[PDB]
Swiss-Prot record, chain A:
Protein name: Exosome complex exonuclease DIS3
Subunit structure: Component of the RNA exosome complex. Specifically part of the catalytically inactive RNA exosome core complex (Exo-9) which associate with the catalytic subunits RRP6 and DIS3 in cytoplasmic- and nuclear-specific RNA exosome complex forms. Exo-9 is formed by a hexameric base ring of RNase PH domain-containing subunits and a cap ring consisting of CSL4, RRP4 and RRP40; DIS3 associates with the base ring of Exo-9. Interacts with GSP1.
Example of a GO cellular component annotation carried by this entry: exosome (RNase complex)
Keyword line: Cytoplasm, Endonuclease, Exonuclease, Exosome, Hydrolase, Mitochondrion, Nuclease, Nucleus, RNA-binding, rRNA processing
Gene Ontology biological-process entries: exonucleolytic trimming to generate mature 3'-end of 5.8S rRNA from tricistronic rRNA transcript (SSU-rRNA, 5.8S rRNA, LSU-rRNA); mRNA processing; nonfunctional rRNA decay; nuclear mRNA surveillance; nuclear mRNA surveillance of mRNA 3'-end processing; nuclear polyadenylation-dependent CUT catabolic process; nuclear polyadenylation-dependent rRNA catabolic process; regulatory ncRNA 3'-end processing
Domain annotation CSD2: ranges: 365-432
Domain S1 motif: 847-944
Keyword Nuclease: yes
Organism of origin: Saccharomyces cerevisiae (strain ATCC 204508 / S288c) (Baker's yeast)
Cofactor(s) listed in the protein's UniProt record: Mg(2+)
Phylogenetic lineage: Eukaryota, Fungi, Dikarya, Ascomycota, Saccharomycotina
Endoribonuclease as annotated region, ranges: 1-227
Curated annotation (Swiss-Prot), chain B:
Subunit-structure text: Component of the RNA exosome complex. Specifically part of the catalytically inactive RNA exosome core complex (Exo-9) which may associate with the catalytic subunits RRP6 and DIS3 in cytoplasmic- and nuclear-specific RNA exosome complex forms. Exo-9 is formed by a hexameric base ring of RNase PH domain-containing subunits and a cap ring consisting of CSL4, RRP4 and RRP40. Interacts with NIP7 and NOP8. Interacts strongly with RRP46.
Protein name as catalogued: Exosome complex component RRP43
Organism placement in taxonomy: Eukaryota, Fungi, Dikarya, Ascomycota, Saccharomycotina
Record annotation: effect of changing residue 27 to T: Interaction with RRP46 abolished
UniProt function note: Non-catalytic component of the RNA exosome complex which has 3'->5' exoribonuclease activity and participates in a multitude of cellular RNA processing and degradation events. In the nucleus, the RNA exosome complex is involved in proper maturation of stable RNA species such as rRNA, snRNA and snoRNA, in the elimination of RNA processing by-products and non-coding 'pervasive' transcripts, such as antisense RNA species and cryptic unstable transcripts (CUTs), and of mRNAs with processing defects, thereby limiting or excluding their export to the cytoplasm.
Note: Present with 3180 molecules/cell in log phase SD medium.
Gene that produces this protein: RRP43
Compartments where found: Cytoplasm; Nucleus, Nucleolus
Top-rank taxon, per record: Eukaryota
Similarity comment: Belongs to the RNase PH family.
Swiss-Prot record, chain C:
An example Gene Ontology molecular-function term: RNA binding
GO CC terms in record: cytoplasmic exosome (RNase complex); exosome (RNase complex); nuclear exosome (RNase complex); nucleolus; nucleus
Superkingdom: Eukaryota
Subcellular location as annotated: Cytoplasm; Nucleus, Nucleolus
Cystine residue pairs: none
Gene3D superfamilies documented for this protein: GHMP Kinase, N-terminal domain
Subunit structure as annotated in this protein's UniProt entry: Component of the RNA exosome complex. Specifically part of the catalytically inactive RNA exosome core complex (Exo-9) which may associate with the catalytic subunits RRP6 and DIS3 in cytoplasmic- and nuclear-specific RNA exosome complex forms. Exo-9 is formed by a hexameric base ring of RNase PH domain-containing subunits and a cap ring consisting of CSL4, RRP4 and RRP40.
Protein name listed in UniProt: Exosome complex component SKI6
InterPro entries given in the database record: ExoRNase_PH_dom1 (IPR001247), ExoRNase_PH_dom2 (IPR015847), ExoRNase_PH_dom2_sf (IPR036345), PNPase/RNase_PH_dom_sf (IPR027408), Ribosomal_Su5_D2-typ_SF (IPR020568), RNase_PH (IPR050080)
GO biological-process terms attached to the record: exonucleolytic trimming to generate mature 3'-end of 5.8S rRNA from tricistronic rRNA transcript (SSU-rRNA, 5.8S rRNA, LSU-rRNA); nuclear mRNA surveillance; nuclear polyadenylation-dependent CUT catabolic process; nuclear-transcribed mRNA catabolic process; nuclear-transcribed mRNA catabolic process, 3'-5' exonucleolytic nonsense-mediated decay; poly(A)-dependent snoRNA 3'-end processing; RNA catabolic process; RNA processing
UniProtKB/Swiss-Prot annotation, chain D:
Keyword Ribonucleoprotein: no
GO biological process: exonucleolytic trimming to generate mature 3'-end of 5.8S rRNA from tricistronic rRNA transcript (SSU-rRNA, 5.8S rRNA, LSU-rRNA); nuclear mRNA surveillance; nuclear polyadenylation-dependent CUT catabolic process; nuclear polyadenylation-dependent rRNA catabolic process; poly(A)-dependent snoRNA 3'-end processing; RNA catabolic process; RNA processing; rRNA catabolic process
Gene3D superfamilies recorded: GHMP Kinase, N-terminal domain (3.30.230.70)
Main function: Non-catalytic component of the RNA exosome complex which has 3'->5' exoribonuclease activity and participates in a multitude of cellular RNA processing and degradation events. In the nucleus, the RNA exosome complex is involved in proper maturation of stable RNA species such as rRNA, snRNA and snoRNA, in the elimination of RNA processing by-products and non-coding 'pervasive' transcripts, such as antisense RNA species and cryptic unstable transcripts (CUTs), and of mRNAs with processing defects, thereby limiting or excluding their export to the cytoplasm.
Keyword field: Cytoplasm, Exosome, Nucleus, RNA-binding, rRNA processing
PANTHER family reported in the protein's UniProt record: EXOSOME COMPLEX COMPONENT (PTHR11953), EXOSOME COMPLEX COMPONENT MTR3 (PTHR11953:SF2)
Protein name: Exosome complex component MTR3
Location of the protein in the cell: Cytoplasm; Nucleus, Nucleolus
Length: 944, 49, 244, 215
RNA sequence: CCCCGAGAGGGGGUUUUUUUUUUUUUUUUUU
């Protein structure tokens, strides 16, 4: 039945059955039918009179424009109501800035999308949440509204009821918006809806099939390319089958690896099996991508490479485990279900081979994805000539058994190839880097003052204390002589240093870090986006900030000549740089001068200035040398990878010069005190919060990583790396130097860096104390704290330190072991994506420098194989591959000795047998050429 | 125990990481065959009060 | 981490209610006249509770007899079919249940005038037929109604309510889904007053949010008192009309 | 595990084994338990099932709970060494037995007194290489023997019989019925069961009297 | 203080045994 309440509210019974672990549970929840559900339209003049405020006393905003996109009659002005299917298929088109401006998303739709896809639902909610003056999405709770709520008719499927529910919403919207002359358009691909309208017994409704609706828009030609779309693969199993298979030990799930060297062979990592199960064949891979979580079924033993009942399959499984131990034959399997696709928006370019210039109508073409481990996709398009030489974004729709290739439809036009705009943009979004400007909800969390924000003159002022009651805990260090040593064009300053000599002979060192925590608060959208990005990526081209410009370049940035809030760490240490005591405190400072690394070094060098500031700068340098020396004695590592800096001519936007950044003594000055700051903070926050302390560890490198390096060293150069301890590894790496070539030591260092374990963030409750060890720094504990503006990890550390000293209680989100695990796993992924995008940015610009230039540069052989060699050019910092065919003449006469890593061959321009060992300095002609298949600017090198 | 009982390890998933519970072998007693209990007959005492 | 919209940006909950609205609260008096001196059948949401008041009467054992006051006993029977998943074991001797029974007794010992019924016993039997969040608050309302039906003197009403705290937001009258997704506070309010007979917090709550949560609960409990009082006068009035 | 018993380690699992009309004779003994007022030993062997049960009567003893013109009787069945039955099933037979002996025991002779009758299902072997129905007539025989051995007044020697899941207890030379029990069985087989059980009732009664006299 | 006789009589104010524990959905620093 249905009961009417006092508020005009109704209530009914929503009952459904959910199957869990082979169980049947009857779930019953009560369903309240309201009468105060807003249409959320600017035109409406009735709803604002019946609307009520939210828990936070805030009435919802009517956002749907009073003058939407006007279309040719009889559509006129109109709102768009979406179906469940059109959302799941064309979410990319729903995010396109050039279409779908005013859209109504029914509750029943939002619910179905949430259950069918988690991710798409989030993207749809973001469109609703993120609405501006360009795009406007709402959620009309039709199930909760008594006016629109429909109930299942006798003998009616749930799919037809839901379609009738959406159709009822459109009718309600249509009748409700009649006085405002705004029609509603139902975008749906469903067959069922039309029959109910063809009769048109009760009311009229304008419905267009997704494709049919697009053909009614002014910009139909610009958005038609975004419309989602004996050979036969074996059908995937039904869902019930795989769930029972996993439970009965018949089927097994894991992540599949597909190498670019072989697309016809995959391997899955299974917990029950020691060695990864191979998957041989194209039917056996079954339309699986690299990184996909797949469910595999073990093939018969006769299918093994170098059954009926479930009992025999478990016996086959045991025989498979035995065969893996014997290492004679290795078990194979076939994927029969795809648990979780690794699919994401994909960047590629149209293949000129599959597009006919003579064709004027719609034609099928192929797009070559930038991922070399991925197949090509079929695309339906009419603008095949306009997308010919451009980086395009495409999204897959389906890959069925009866099609040799996956089918995809275009999403966006990034730009032309080898252009700074298109290549940088493609570079970022391929490494999952959000570069879009901060939304309005984000920018609203910023101070109301704006750029004219200022730290209070008096820290006891009634007004200032009234607004900030924590200001009394704020220390005053504006009398100190603070200076910042950062690169030339650095506007986002994180760290600031000072030094005084205490009357007791000891030194007072203070490291001051930007007080980002004071501006970004947990829960806000600003903090949300900050955590999402994890870190700001650094390119030669641009600079994608983690926080808004107003905050990171000014308010938080420790700029000179201005009063800025900061989290300060002050030490009292002797002349031998030994810490006597350490204090943490939130303070307010004023930077005396923002030096550059070259500018700071010259000031010290001159002897020109006796000023109290410069005298302090010299003192800091003296401490740093002592501090660095202690670390080296302790067992600190000294790895190296000084990447090149793409010089840009003032005269020409295009890059022409590639130089190298030199490490000045001021770089060692800043580095030593930043490390000192991070260490002291790490010790303090862990002492205060032993279970949720944001820390950073570095695993010790396995012996297997250096066994190959020591193999090449002991064979060719007759040397070795100890690996017994970090100090032992450092000492042996240090003596690893050739007198005939000084760069040999640098080459070994930059090569022994590749075999180091990746450092990761974590929380102190996830590991034990001995696991806090940082191998590369030889410290028992460590954390990131000095760069709040460009690292969210520091922000967490700042909040934890503030709670550690008693300045302000630590937020619950930083004391939840579960929430901390999510933060760490995110910033770890964002960190990797940051460096990879950064290195890719260097790769593009350097590749553009050598675009139309050939020069004999110095090269070093780092990898020796039978198919060719790999040489590294330190001048450009680019590794190149010289194939055997282009390496020498007569490939059948060349020989490769794995024992000596020697490759003997007869050069093309000669006839004398030359033996090319490893680590050899060779002359190499550089040349760049974009591959016609991968569209990636590679550097073809020819030795001499 | 059965030579090769089909029942092997049972996979249990955590929050991201995976683990496998060790295969439990079902021990079965013989319907007929039996061995006598090895009692230290030198130690068997009898009660009196 | 909840994938469901516990509190949507539209200010709507999973069941449709807003932040501040009680759940259908339907009371029923004199439901079991041949089984008890006083009886009440409570329906607060999907919650279904039978409450029986037997007494004041002679104690079954003279050993357990007070010559200055009546003996008040409460036994809560949470049936094995109260929740979607049937519980295999009984809850009769469960520590959680013993605490509930004890709690209820300690509540009404200071409300029921036991002093005017010396050398007697008041037995309160409760049967929970269905459970869906806020069962403690519903237990309080059931006893208060049943006791009044039995004509047993008491100083005032005792209304029970539960309030959840999802993030910052406070949710009145939470159900099973909401209780599983957030910390809740159970409040017993005496009459129209600000005085609490029962304050129950079993999960973590920030110290700053607790006062506001109490404020919401007290206001909501006052509405429960009004509904109980309303239905009681209605039942009274009809009886008076028909009897007189 | 339990703080009142020694049940051993919890990880231990019980040993489970694997694979690689007919005339009835019974033995009767009374008064071998000095601990109580009356006791009986009833052993029966037939086909692929033998049973050895012991009965013990404690009373008439004091009753705390209430005043009584007549006596009060309680019967409890206990599981024996190996064979086991559901507690519910043992309670059900106990109730069925209480009804029977409340028709036989001269309760009027024992005011404010309690007669507690215990029947131990000591050894019930099932050799077939609701089974409780075949044990019921032997229980009644044991309780009757024990009560008579105790010196508790009986209106008549109550005995019983079992036939195809049907159990019926007789008194007064089989003229009347003091209890009727039926599980499973067939349809319209009442008359056949009554005759077969009365034959067992007569045989049991003769052996009981022979035991109460000669022994 | 309480009940029954018209006058210092009588009758009542309320004691003792029974049965175990779970619990909800590629290092490092500044950028
Ligand atoms: Zn409206």
């Amino acid at each position: 039945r249905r009961k009417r309440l006092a508020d005009g509210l109704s209530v009914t019974q929503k009952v459904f059955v959910r199957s869990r672990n082979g169980g049947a549970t009857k779930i019953v929840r009560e369903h309240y039918l309201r009468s105060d559900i807003p249409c959320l339209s600017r035109s409406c003049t009735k709803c604002p009179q019946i609307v009520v405020p939210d828990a936070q006393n805030e009435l919802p905003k009517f956002i749907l424009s009073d003058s939407p996109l006007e279309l040719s009659a009889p559509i006129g002005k109109h709102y768009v109501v979406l179906d469940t299917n059109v959302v799941l298929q064309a979410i990319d088109l729903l995010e396109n800035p050039n279409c779908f401006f005013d859209v109504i998303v029914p509750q029943i739709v939002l619910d179905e999308v949430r259950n069918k896809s988690y991710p798409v639902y989030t993207r749809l909610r973001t469109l609703c949440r993120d609405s501006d003056d360009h795009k406007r999405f709402i959620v009309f709770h039709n199930e909760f509204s008594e006016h629109t709520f429909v109930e299942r008719l006798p003998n009616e499927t749930i799919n037809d009821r839901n379609n009738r529910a959406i159709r009822k919403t459109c009718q309600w919207y249509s009748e409700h918006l009649k006085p405002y002359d705004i029609n509603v358009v139902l975008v749906t691909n469903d067959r069922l809806n039309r029959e109910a309208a063809t009769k048109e017994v009760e009311s009229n409704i304008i419905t267009k099939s997704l494709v049919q609706y697009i053909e009614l828009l002014p910009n139909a030609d610009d958005i038609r390319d975004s419309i989602p779309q004996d050979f036969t693969f074996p059908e995937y199993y039904s869902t019930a089958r795989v769930m029972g298979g996993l439970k009965n030990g018949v089927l097994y799930q894991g992540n599949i690896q597909i190498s670019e060297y072989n697309f016809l062979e995959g391997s899955v990592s299974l917990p029950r099996f020691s060695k990864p199960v191979l998957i041989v064949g194209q039917k056996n891979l079954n339309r699986a991508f690299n990184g996909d979580q797949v469910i595999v079924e073990l093939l018969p033993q006769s299918e093994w490479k170098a059954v009926i009942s479930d009992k025999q399959r478990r016996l086959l499984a045991k025989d498979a485990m035995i065969a893996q131990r014997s290492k004679k034959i290795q078990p194979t399997a076939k994927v029969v279900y795809i648990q979780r696709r690794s699919w994401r928006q994909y960047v590629g370019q149209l293949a000129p081979s599959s597009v006919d210039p003579q064709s004027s109508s719609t034609q099928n073409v192929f797009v070559i994805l930038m991922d070399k481990c991925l197949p090509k996709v079929r695309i339906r398009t009419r603008r095949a000539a306009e997308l010919l030489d451009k980086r395009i974004v495409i999204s897959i729709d389906s890959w069925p058994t009866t099609h040799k290739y996956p089918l995809g439809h275009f999403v966006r036009d990034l730009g032309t190839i080898e252009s700074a705009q298109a290549e940088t943009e493609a570079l970022l979004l391929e490494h999952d880097v959000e570069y879009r400007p901060f939304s309005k909800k984000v920018l609203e969390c910023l101070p109301a003052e704006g750029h004219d924000w200022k730290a209070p003159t008096k820290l006891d002022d009634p007004e200032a204390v009234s607004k900030d009651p924590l200001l009394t805990k704020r220390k005053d260090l504006r009398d100190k002589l603070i200076c910042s040593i950062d690169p030339p064009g650095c506007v986002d300053i994180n760290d600031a240093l000072h030094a005084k000599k205490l009357p007791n002979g000891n030194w007072e060192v203070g490291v001051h870090i930007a007080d980002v925590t004071h501006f970004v608060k947990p829960g806000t959208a600003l903090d949300a986006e900050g955590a999402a990005r994890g870190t700001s990526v650094y390119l030669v081209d641009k600079r994608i900030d983690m926080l808004p410009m107003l905050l990171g370049t000014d308010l938080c940035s420790l700029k000179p000549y201005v009063d800025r809030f900061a989290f300060s760490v002050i030490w009292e240490l002797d002349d031998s740089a030994n810490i006597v005591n350490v204090n943490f405190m939130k303070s307010v400072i004023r930077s005396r001068e923002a030096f550059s690394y070259e500018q700071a070094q010259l000031r010290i060098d001159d002897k020109t200035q006796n000023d109290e500031l410069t005298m302090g700068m010299r003192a800091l340098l003296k401490l740093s040398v002592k501090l660095k020396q202690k670390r080296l004695e302790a067992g600190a590592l000294n790895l190296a990878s000084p990447e090149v800096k793409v010089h840009m001519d003032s005269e020409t936007s295009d890059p022409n010069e590639v130089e190298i950044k030199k490490l000045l003594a001021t770089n060692s000055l800043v580095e030593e005190f930043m490390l000192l700051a991070n260490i002291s903070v790490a010790r303090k926050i862990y002492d205060a919060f032993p279970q949720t302390a944001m820390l950073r560890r570095h695993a010790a490198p396995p012996s297997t990583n250096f066994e190959i390096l020591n193999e090449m060293l002991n064979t060719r150069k007759n040397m070795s790396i100890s690996l017994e301890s970090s100090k032992a590894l450092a000492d042996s790496l240090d003596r690893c130097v050739d007198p005939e070539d000084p760069y040999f030591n640098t080459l070994v260092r930059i090569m022994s860096t590749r075999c180091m374990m990746a450092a990761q963030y974590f929380y102190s409750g996830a590991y034990s104390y001995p696991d806090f060890r940082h191998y590369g720094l030889a410290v028992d504990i460590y954390t990131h704290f000095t760069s709040p503006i460009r690292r969210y990890c520091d922000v967490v550390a700042h909040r934890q330190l503030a709670g550690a000293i008693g300045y302000e209680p630590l937020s619950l989100t930083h004391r939840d072991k579960n929430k901390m695990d999510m933060i760490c796993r995110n910033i770890n992924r964002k960190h990797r994506n940051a460096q990879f995008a950064g290195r890719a940015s260097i790769e593009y610009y350097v590749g553009q420098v050598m675009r139309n230039n050939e020069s004999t540069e110095t090269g070093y052989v780092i990898k020796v194989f039978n198919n060719g060699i790999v040489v590294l050019v330190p001048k450009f910092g680019v590794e190149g591959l010289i194939r055997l065919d282009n390496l020498t003449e007569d490939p059948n006469s060349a020989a490769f000795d794995e024992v000596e890593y020697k490759l003997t061959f007869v050069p093309t321009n000669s006839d004398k047998p030359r033996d090319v060992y490893v680590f050899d300095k060779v002359e190499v002609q550089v040349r760049s050429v974009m591959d016609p298949i991968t569209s990636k600017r590679k550097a073809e090198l020819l030795l001499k | 125990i059965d030579e090769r009982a089909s029942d092997l390890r049972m996979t249990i998933r955590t929050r991201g990481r995976s683990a496998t519970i060790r295969e439990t072998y079902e021990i079965i007693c013989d319907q007929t065959k039996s061995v006598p209990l090895m009692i230290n007959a030198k130690n068997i005492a009898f009660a009196s009060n | 981490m909840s994938r469901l919209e516990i509190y949507s940006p539209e200010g709507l909950r999973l069941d449709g209610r807003r932040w501040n609205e009680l759940r259908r609260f339907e009371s029923s008096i004199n439901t079991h006249p041949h089984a008890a001196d006083g009886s009440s059948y409570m329906e607060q949401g999907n919650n279904k509770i039978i409450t029986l008041v037997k007494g004041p009467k002679e104690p079954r054992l003279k050993s357990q007899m007070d010559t200055s006051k009546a003996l008040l006993n409460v036994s809560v029977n949470i049936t094995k079919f109260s929740k979607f998943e049937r519980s295999k074991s009984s809850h009769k001797n469960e520590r959680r249940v013993l605490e509930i029974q004890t709690s209820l007794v300690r509540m009404f010992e200071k409300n029921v005038m036991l002093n005017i019924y010396p050398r007697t016993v008041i037995d309160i039997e409760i049967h929970v037929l269905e459970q869906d969040g806020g069962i403690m608050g519903s237990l309080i309302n059931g006893i208060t109604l049943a006791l009044i039906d039995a004509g047993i003197s008491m100083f005032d009403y005792i209304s029970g309510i539960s309030v959840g705290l999802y993030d910052t937001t406070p949710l009145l009258d939470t159900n099973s889904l909401e209780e599983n997704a957030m910390s809740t506070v159970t409040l017993g309010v005496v009459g129209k007053s600000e005085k609490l007979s029962l304050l129950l917090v079993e999960d973590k709550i920030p110290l700053d949010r607790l006062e506001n949560v109490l404020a919401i609960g007290i206001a909501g409990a006052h509405r429960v008192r009004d509904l109980m009082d309303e239905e009681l006068r209605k039942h009274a009035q009809k009886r008076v009309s028909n009897a007189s | 595990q339990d703080r009142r018993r020694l049940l051993g380690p919890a990880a231990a699992k019980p040993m489970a084994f694997s694979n690689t009309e007919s005339e009835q004779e019974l033995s009767l003994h009374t008064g071998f338990i000095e601990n109580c007022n009356g006791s009986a030993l009833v052993e029966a062997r037939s086909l692929g099932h033998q049973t050895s049960l012991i009965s013990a009567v404690y009373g008439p003893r004091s009753i705390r709970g209430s005043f009584t013109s007549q006596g009060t009787i309680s019967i409890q069945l206990k599981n024996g060494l190996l064979e086991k039955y559901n507690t519910n099933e043992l309670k059900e037979v106990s109730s069925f037995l209480m009804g029977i002996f409340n028709s036989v025991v001269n309760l009027s002779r024992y005011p404010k007194s309690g007669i507690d009758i215990f029947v131990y299902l000591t050894y019930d072997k099932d050799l077939t290489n609701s089974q409780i129905s075949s044990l019921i007539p032997h229980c009644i025989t044991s309780i009757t023997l024990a009560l008579a051995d105790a010196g508790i007044e009986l209106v008549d020697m109550a005995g019983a019989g079992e036939a195809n899941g049907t159990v019926v207890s007789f008194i007064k030379n089989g003229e009347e019925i003091v209890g009727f029990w039926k599980d499973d069985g067939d349809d319209e087989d009442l008359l056949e069961c009554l005759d077969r059980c009365k034959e067992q009732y007569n045989r049991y009664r003769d052996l009981m009297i022979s035991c109460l006299m000669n022994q």
